[PDB]
Design an enzyme around this catalytic site. Structure first.
Site, PDB file in Angstrom:
ATOM      1  N   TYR A 282      16.328  -4.108   2.226  1.00 58.16           N
ATOM      2  CA  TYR A 282      15.552  -4.922   1.305  1.00 58.16           C
ATOM      3  C   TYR A 282      15.699  -6.302   1.947  1.00 58.16           C
ATOM      4  O   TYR A 282      14.750  -6.819   2.519  1.00 58.16           O
ATOM      5  CB  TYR A 282      16.101  -4.883  -0.129  1.00 58.16           C
TER       6      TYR A 282
ATOM      7  N   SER B  24       8.800  -3.127  -0.673  1.00 60.89           N
ATOM      8  CA  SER B  24       8.590  -4.530  -1.013  1.00 60.89           C
ATOM      9  C   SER B  24       9.080  -5.429   0.112  1.00 60.89           C
ATOM     10  O   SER B  24       8.607  -5.315   1.240  1.00 60.89           O
ATOM     11  CB  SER B  24       9.339  -4.833  -2.316  1.00 60.89           C
ATOM     12  N   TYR B  25      10.014  -6.329  -0.177  1.00 58.09           N
ATOM     13  CA  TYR B  25      10.538  -7.190   0.879  1.00 58.09           C
ATOM     14  C   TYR B  25      11.107  -6.261   1.958  1.00 58.09           C
ATOM     15  O   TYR B  25      11.028  -6.552   3.153  1.00 58.09           O
ATOM     16  CB  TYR B  25      11.638  -8.120   0.339  1.00 58.09           C
TER      17      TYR B  25
ATOM     18  N   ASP C   3      -1.823  -2.334  -6.750  1.00 62.52           N
ATOM     19  CA  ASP C   3      -0.632  -3.183  -6.692  1.00 62.52           C
ATOM     20  C   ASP C   3      -1.094  -4.625  -6.939  1.00 62.52           C
ATOM     21  O   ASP C   3      -1.769  -5.226  -6.106  1.00 62.52           O
ATOM     22  CB  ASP C   3       0.002  -3.091  -5.306  1.00 62.52           C
TER      23      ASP C   3
ATOM     24  N   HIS D 214       2.918  -1.806  -7.690  1.00 60.25           N
ATOM     25  CA  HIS D 214       4.066  -2.051  -6.823  1.00 60.25           C
ATOM     26  C   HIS D 214       5.232  -1.064  -6.969  1.00 60.25           C
ATOM     27  O   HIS D 214       5.988  -0.842  -6.014  1.00 60.25           O
ATOM     28  CB  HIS D 214       4.586  -3.472  -7.028  1.00 60.25           C
TER      29      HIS D 214
END
Ligand SMILES: CS(=O)(=O)c1ccc(C2NOC([C@@H](CC3CC3)[C@H](N)C(=O)N3CC[C@H](F)C3)N2)c(F)c1
Ligand SMILES: CS(=O)(=O)c1ccc(C2NOC([C@@H](CC3CC3)[C@H](N)C(=O)N3CC[C@H](F)C3)N2)c(F)c1
Ligand SMILES: *[C@@H]1O[C@H](CO)[C@@H](O[C@@H]2O[C@H](CO)[C@@H](O)[C@H](O)[C@H]2NC(C)=O)[C@H](O)[C@H]1NC(C)=O
Ligand SMILES: *[C@@H]1O[C@H](CO)[C@@H](O[C@@H]2O[C@H](CO)[C@@H](O)[C@H](O)[C@H]2NC(C)=O)[C@H](O)[C@H]1NC(C)=O
Ligand SMILES: *[C@@H]1O[C@H](CO)[C@@H](O[C@@H]2O[C@H](CO)[C@@H](O)[C@H](O)[C@H]2NC(C)=O)[C@H](O)[C@H]1NC(C)=O
Ligand SMILES: *[C@@H]1O[C@H](CO)[C@@H](O[C@@H]2O[C@H](CO)[C@@H](O)[C@H](O)[C@H]2NC(C)=O)[C@H](O)[C@H]1NC(C)=O
Ligand SMILES: *[C@@H]1O[C@H](CO)[C@@H](O[C@@H]2O[C@H](CO)[C@@H](O)[C@H](O)[C@H]2NC(C)=O)[C@H](O)[C@H]1NC(C)=O
Ligand SMILES: *[C@@H]1O[C@H](CO)[C@@H](O[C@@H]2O[C@H](CO)[C@@H](O)[C@H](O)[C@H]2NC(C)=O)[C@H](O)[C@H]1NC(C)=O
Ligand SMILES: *[C@@H]1O[C@H](CO)[C@@H](O[C@H]2O[C@H](CO)[C@@H](O)[C@H](O)[C@H]2NC(C)=O)[C@H](O)[C@H]1NC(C)=O
Ligand SMILES: *[C@@H]1O[C@H](CO)[C@@H](O[C@H]2O[C@H](CO)[C@@H](O)[C@H](O)[C@H]2NC(C)=O)[C@H](O)[C@H]1NC(C)=O
Ligand SMILES: *[C@H]1O[C@H](CO)[C@@H](O[C@@H]2O[C@H](CO)[C@@H](O)[C@H](O)[C@H]2NC(C)=O)[C@H](O)[C@H]1NC(C)=O
Ligand SMILES: *[C@@H]1O[C@H](CO)[C@@H](O)[C@H](O)[C@H]1NC(C)=O
Ligand SMILES: *[C@@H]1O[C@H](CO)[C@@H](O)[C@H](O)[C@H]1NC(C)=O
Ligand SMILES: *[C@@H]1O[C@H](CO)[C@@H](O)[C@H](O)[C@H]1NC(C)=O
Ligand SMILES: *[C@@H]1O[C@H](CO)[C@@H](O)[C@H](O)[C@H]1NC(C)=O
Ligand SMILES: *[C@@H]1O[C@H](CO)[C@@H](O)[C@H](O)[C@H]1NC(C)=O
Ligand SMILES: *[C@@H]1O[C@H](CO)[C@@H](O)[C@H](O)[C@H]1NC(C)=O
Lengths: 728, 728
Positions: A509, A592-593, A670, A702
């Site tokens: 992450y 995500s990240y 998203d 998301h």
């Protein structure tokens, strides 16, 4: 023999984790849901009674999503027709049930499509937002009082947040705050008139002939942000005047000079409210403390009570300026701020003195303030054993700061190192919630003597079941890089043998203030991979990670896509040099990240990774929202940080993807990290002649948390990982 | 030792087919572009001269997309700033160069962003459309006359077609028709006011921060269609002082009763124009013949000169009513229509006589009328050797229909069995274009004695290169199904050995009136699959296919997704029983309608196919346009054909995909078959827990033809097919 933890076990949730969700309703009673009916529990003795029998709303005609009891116990708010919106926002219908007359109120009912509802903190007054305007009901069966008339879909928001304030500032949808005894109602008003709209298709069920275009005010990096205004209305005057006046409280001159944000609202007393503002350049914030003037009916914030919080090394706060906790008389407060050493600790402030006093200190940090009494302040930190990934409850004596007791540390040190807490109304009792490294454990405690009252849920049922399965083990440790330690965890396969070479999957992450290395117990995809596929699943918290001081957290300030990306690569190397890792089978994946970092890593040309999976990744910071992005990256202009904005995109490394196997996945609906981000990655890969695997999830956001999509994505990813590692 | 035709060969066009595209400018001369030079050729002798120097515009400062010489050879229209829109539409900038005075006109130049432009049929007048309005220029250097003033983007179209008319009716953006000598200019006007818009995102270059939303009036099945009106204007009496007057010609009352379409416009003489109208229920069309009334200035269409054309088994015409071919005096005309046997033949019509006489007949069909003289009518048909996939040029004596002569059959039977033709202005000369089974061959002939003047291009260069590569062969043949024969073709690998078992790929389209089994020579993906991978690529024309009569073509009337799908399965089933096919490795793939059939097949549960690939498929007919869909399916209402609209979706078959490997591909900017169609397929597969492969192509449309995307899709599909067949 003994079966292993399979993919189906995870996807079908065969091994269910038990928990104990209770709701304090007073200083010594709480509600618990046991077999559809609501019981009330006496904390002191543990005896209970049926508060509301499940058969009460059988012929209601509607499935009830949630309930809420008014502070005085006289009424219960029933919620149904739940329609989720973003992370916290949703719409629903509501009915009020009179618990005394055991009847369902049928007059002057809450409108359908109500965006948000909340009881007053005391009594049974109600405040709700409908069609972007605020309304107030003094009594459940009486007509509402309109507070605002400016409400306007996607333009003016009164009492509720717009998209970016909900997601990145308040972690909530409501933007209204009842004063302690309910007399005053404060609220924010957001104006998105000039905020650009993100637009994307939503296909809905097969029966919809034409796709729908979802349009939402969303400020991308450097774009026009919504403006905000703050007001306070005296609800006690509603029945005495035709149109009660919303007194506005303007932001300080130091904020009005440019774009800013209202970032915190906290009432101090019946007639005192504190507000924290933050400049669009998030390294400067001001807190005003305002008193009601019974003579002018106005609100005044004396500059002598204004507090400045800034940062020279990064932004202010972990994700935003911290919340203050006032003493009963409202003349002082405690707040977590980073000290001269860069560590976050509790500072004691006098409301009219600019210099505060730190009451805790050390090379560790306070996670949050959990409760404050006239004699003690209770908080959670990662001080114990110097483990930044651990969490424990502590008590400090206000009359003698040298007296600090750890209330959770030694309760069961081998099974419990990550604690959470929940105090009763006056902090007379507290439920402790241990979440790892062992099976979750919930206990109740008395504050008067810190004695354990009893065990609420020990998860024995699950412990029993897991005995017949080859569960994986977890190792939490650290490596030293440049005279500084960096923590990592590994989910090791059953019967792990360091004399063997295992394939390794780096679970990443790594966004600012992240922590993927901790003492929490999880039953997830990595469990299945280690237990059944004999894959080692690792995570590493390098530069930029949190809870270890600003030196480490602000290392990526204005430089996202650099150190946190490189350190992750270095982590892989470090792991391979441990001798039990097959250098030919090292994969990386993240959401995500984590999707961004994974992509950046796969396109670095390091040669360390064989394949990788990016789910809903960010691909260029100019595509993400302003509040979050600018916090770490400043503005995307030539006079500020544009060069690094253009330099940290995934697309610019497309060519290097010829060296690895890549799987790109994204949900089409998203609203957070727009599909646009992967659409641009794929196009860049197509433009340089690179083959890769892709998968879109129709109408998923998301989280891709839909039951069917969730099972589908992990199944798809499993095949890809097994193929890359050729298990087969 | 001799390489094979590789994937790179196909993708880089290493083996280029030579063509010979000429333009007839009179009854004995044509223009041919050579080395960027426009040469003029004398057909009788073959001698040429340079018409325009490739260096004439050496410093034009613009990339010339195309050119167009006025009929009188006096001017040349230069096209640049080309920007593509749909299948035929586009906008560009134009400049006119004076050939006589070798000068580039700079006064009153055509506007930029012009939608359509065309020279009058004789002389050098111009008519162009700009901002949805029609303009006329009597002289290249003089101011233009505004004909229409109602033009409005996405609403009112004058002289140009809207999305559906462009794609499904006229196969052209143009909606204006010059009279034979240029006196009159006829034009249609479309009104899409109530036509819903299809909306989708376009991401553009990485630099665009916010995705743009494209919206185009697009009527899906059952939706509100655009309305149409027809006008005729006299360009000889235009005034700079008064607004041009347009005379309207209304459609017949049998058409005005309900929704309808304008489907054909054909000038008969200088003062007579014919129009065909089609009811929304496409099985009834009406032709009107209108004469200009000199005294009145109006256009009259005598009811006695009205011709009705209807169908009881299906729709009218292959894709719409055929065009009439009037004689010199305009008193009679020839038109291809379906006879009492269901085969399309030429019928001779008297303008004021209801019954027409067929001049051709037989269990074969006329493809098109190519040229007409007082003594002969020239046409192309698939009569020769009863091969429906063969095409030849014939002439029939207008005074004795028993006298029919094939002009292309015997020229070179082994090499040439599929011809198209190009006649000069008065049919004095014709160019024959042979395109298979051997390499394309272009020749010039004289009509008087049907002499073979000379060879224009024989592709002897390509033949010399191809002998250095192991090319595959093509077998065209048929199978029988219920006393009916159906044709198929197989692209067989080099050195085909019928003692061995080869994997088989079924290349399918199968839409109504399609033909995938023919004698045309092609260099495509199939060539590479058979030459390099030793895969047999077969195609089959079952029920629904064209050029074989209505009994076959109309078999799927109001029943799409049934027999054409079932017949493909039967064909594969039969091919699987042949000695040379590996029944364990049979795949299927298609694009567009072929994507739908491939999907319907894979979701059939027949167990015949191991894997399949669907590119930009239709998934449910209610998502496709009205004109094409309703033509075959009627209206999607309970009173008409809704039940079958709902029973013929791909989504309802999701569950059956559990036992096959499926790759689904689609461009996100497909304006024809909306991404939506594939988004619903993927959602249905996810909803039943079936895993599959997918690939979206950012900003690509129905053609997925941009250079990089094209190479990427075929590369990705190649890996998929080779993997499905366990091929190195
Ligand atoms: C526990 S973990 O996996 O390390 C983890 C996971 C997620 C976050 C995290 N950071 O920002 C967010 C979250 C706000 C936060 C809810 C209040 C943020 N808005 C977000 O979703 N993105 C998407 C792209 C970029 F990554 C930021 N979530 C985090 F800080 C740590
Ligand atoms: C030579 S083939 O591959 O058999 C072949 C290929 C394509 C067509 C064909 N039919 O309708 C169209 C085309 C009409 C316009 C004339 C070009 C039509 N509008 C289309 O693109 N679709 C998309 C979904 C559905 F399949 C029809 N194109 C056809 F009739 C035969
Ligand atoms: C838990 O049990 C206790 C003990 O029976 C209950 O105590 C009530 O205490 C009040 C205050 O002295 C007395 O007036 C009541 O007489 C007690 N109960 C009864 C029925 O006499 C208590 O109510 C119980 N709480 C719950 C939630 O069940
Ligand atoms: C929200 O902010 C916008 C500014 O973007 C305000 O709109 C301006 O309002 C004034 C006074 O009505 C007008 O003179 C301007 O023409 C408006 N500007 C725009 C963008 O049209 C709007 O009034 C604000 N709304 C509220 C409730 O404060
Ligand atoms: C209640 O009071 C507010 C505050 O003045 C009124 O809002 C004003 O309404 C007028 C006319 O509708 C507008 O010109 C102003 O722009 C509004 N001001 C604000 C703060 O928006 C509101 O209309 C009053 N409601 C009633 C029922 O009287
Ligand atoms: C809640 O707090 C408010 C604010 O102090 C109280 O209202 C004040 O009450 C005093 C009497 O104690 C009056 O002199 C003021 O005029 C009131 N001011 C306002 C704004 O109302 C209120 O009494 C408290 N409520 C309760 C239930 O104690
Ligand atoms: C094109 O055809 C039109 C129509 O026949 C010709 O116009 C007619 O010409 C005659 C002879 O001068 C006039 O008496 C008529 O009044 C005209 N009719 C109309 C409707 O204009 C025209 O001359 C022809 N154009 C060319 C270039 O040959
Ligand atoms: C043209 O096709 C339509 C539709 O198939 C025919 O109209 C009727 O269609 C319904 C079903 O939609 C049938 O129940 C009727 O039997 C059809 N006929 C009539 C008179 O309603 C129409 O007949 C066809 N026209 C021709 C000339 O065949
Ligand atoms: C093709 O050749 C002929 C002669 O062989 C060219 O000449 C014809 O046309 C010329 C002008 O257009 C005249 O000068 C000749 O007298 C005439 N000859 C005949 C027999 O008609 C003709 O122009 C050439 N055409 C091209 C396009 O080059
Ligand atoms: C294009 O079509 C529209 C709609 O059919 C025509 O407008 C009209 O429809 C309106 C309802 O949306 C009616 O209120 C109007 O009375 C009706 N006519 C007019 C002039 O408004 C419109 O006229 C058409 N435009 C053209 C140029 O023909
Ligand atoms: C269409 O656009 C072209 C290009 O902008 C115009 O041509 C001139 O282009 C030069 C620079 O290329 C500019 O300085 C001029 O302003 C443009 N106009 C003229 C008259 O010189 C062209 O004029 C445009 N024409 C129309 C009808 O839009
Ligand atoms: C409450 O409802 C649950 C499920 O409907 C049932 O199992 C339980 O016995 C009920 N108890 C009471 C007191 O109604
Ligand atoms: C909410 O919607 C229901 C469903 O139609 C309706 O019957 C009810 O009266 C509505 N309640 C209110 C307060 O509008
Ligand atoms: C805030 O950050 C900006 C960007 O680096 C910087 O220019 C400014 O000096 C900082 N302000 C403070 C108070 O640190
Ligand atoms: C015209 O230019 C082309 C290249 O565009 C060149 O090949 C050719 O030689 C030129 N024509 C002549 C007659 O030289
Ligand atoms: C032509 O008609 C248009 C459309 O109403 C009008 O605006 C324009 O002024 C007219 N010009 C002349 C010369 O009549
Ligand atoms: C004849 O064959 C067709 C398929 O070619 C089939 O659908 C039909 O049922 C068979 N029988 C008749 C009477 O058509």
């Amino acid at each position: 023999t003994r079966k292993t933890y399979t993919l189906t076990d995870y996807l079908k949730n065969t091994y269910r984790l038990k928990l104990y969700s209770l709701r304090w309703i007073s200083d010594h009673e709480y509600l618990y849901k046991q077999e559809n009916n609501i019981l009330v529990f006496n904390a002191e003795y543990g005896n209970s009674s049926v508060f509301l029998e499940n058969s009460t709303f059988d012929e209601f005609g509607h499935s009830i999503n949630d309930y809420s009891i008014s502070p005085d116990g006289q009424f219960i708010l029933l919620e149904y027709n739940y329609v989720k919106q973003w992370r916290h926002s949703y719409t629903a219908s509501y009915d009020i049930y009179d618990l005394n007359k055991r009847q369902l109120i049928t007059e002057e009912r809450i409108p359908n499509n109500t965006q948000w509802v909340t009881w007053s903190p005391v009594g049974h007054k109600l405040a709700y937002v409908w069609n972007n305007d605020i309304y107030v009901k003094i009594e459940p069966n009486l007509p509402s009082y309109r507070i605002t008339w400016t409400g306007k879909e996607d333009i003016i928001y009164n009492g509720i947040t717009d998209w970016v304030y909900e997601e990145e500032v308040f972690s909530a949808y409501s933007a209204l705050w009842w004063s302690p005894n309910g007399t005053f109602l404060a609220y924010a008003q957001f104006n998105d008139t000039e905020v650009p709209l993100i637009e994307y298709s939503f296909y809905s069920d097969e029966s919809l002939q034409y796709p729908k275009t979802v349009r939402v005010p969303y400020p991308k990096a450097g774009a026009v942000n919504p403006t905000v205004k703050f007001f306070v209305v005296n609800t006690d005057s509603l029945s005495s005047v035709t149109n009660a006046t919303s007194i506005q409280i303007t932001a300080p001159a130091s904020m009005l000079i440019g774009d800013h944000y209202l970032c915190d609202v906290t009432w101090a007393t019946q007639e005192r409210i504190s507000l924290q503002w933050l400049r669009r350049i998030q390294n400067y914030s001001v807190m005003d403390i305002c008193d009601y003037d019974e003579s002018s009916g106005r609100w005044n914030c004396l500059v002598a009570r204004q507090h400045i919080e800034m940062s020279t090394t990064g932004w202010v706060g972990r994700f935003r300026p911290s919340e203050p906790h006032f003493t009963l008389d409202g003349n002082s407060f405690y707040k977590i701020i980073s000290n001269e050493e860069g560590y976050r600790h509790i500072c004691y402030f006098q409301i009219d003195k600019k210099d505060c006093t730190f009451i805790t200190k050390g090379t560790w940090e306070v996670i949050g303030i959990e409760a404050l009494t006239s004699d003690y302040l209770y908080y959670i930190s990662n001080e114990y054993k110097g483990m930044p990934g651990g969490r424990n409850l502590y008590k400090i004596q206000l009359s003698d700061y040298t007296k600090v007791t750890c209330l959770s540390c030694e309760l069961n040190p081998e099974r419990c190192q990550y604690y959470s807490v929940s105090f009763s109304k006056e902090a007379k009792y507290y439920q402790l919630r241990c979440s790892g490294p062992g099976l979750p454990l919930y206990t109740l405690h008395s504050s008067v003597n810190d004695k354990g009252l009893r065990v609420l849920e020990d998860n024995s049922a699950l412990d029993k079941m897991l005995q017949n399965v080859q569960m994986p083990s977890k190792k939490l440790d650290f490596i030293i890089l440049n005279e500084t330690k960096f923590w990592y965890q590994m989910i090791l396969p059953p019967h792990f043998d360091k004399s063997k070479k295992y394939p390794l999957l780096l679970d990443v992450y790594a966004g600012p203030c992240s922590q993927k290395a901790d003492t929490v117990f999880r039953l997830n995809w990595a469990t299945y991979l280690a237990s059944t596929e004999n894959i080692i699943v690792a995570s590493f918290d390098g530069r930029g990670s949190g809870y270890q001081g600003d030196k480490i957290m602000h290392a990526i300030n204005r430089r996202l896509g650099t150190f946190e990306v490189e350190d992750q690569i270095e982590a892989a190397r470090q792991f391979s040099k441990m001798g039990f890792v097959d250098n030919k089978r090292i994969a990386i994946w993240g959401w995500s990240y984590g999707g961004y970092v994974t992509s950046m890593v796969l396109g670095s040309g390091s040669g360390v990774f064989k394949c990788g999976i990016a789910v809903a990744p960010v691909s260029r910071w100019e595509y993400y929202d302003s509040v979050y992005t600018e916090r770490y990256m400043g503005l995307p202009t030539p006079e500020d940080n544009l060069d690094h904005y253009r330099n940290s995109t995934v697309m610019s490394r497309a060519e290097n993807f010829k060296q690895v196997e890549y799987l790109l996945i994204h949900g089409t609906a998203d609203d957070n990290v727009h599909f646009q981000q992967s659409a641009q990655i794929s196009k860049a890969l197509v433009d340089v002649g690179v083959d890769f695997q892709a998968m879109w999830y129709t109408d998923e956001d998301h989280g891709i948390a839909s039951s069917t999509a969730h099972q589908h994505i992990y199944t798809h990813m499993s095949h890809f990982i097994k193929q890359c590692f050729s298990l087969p």
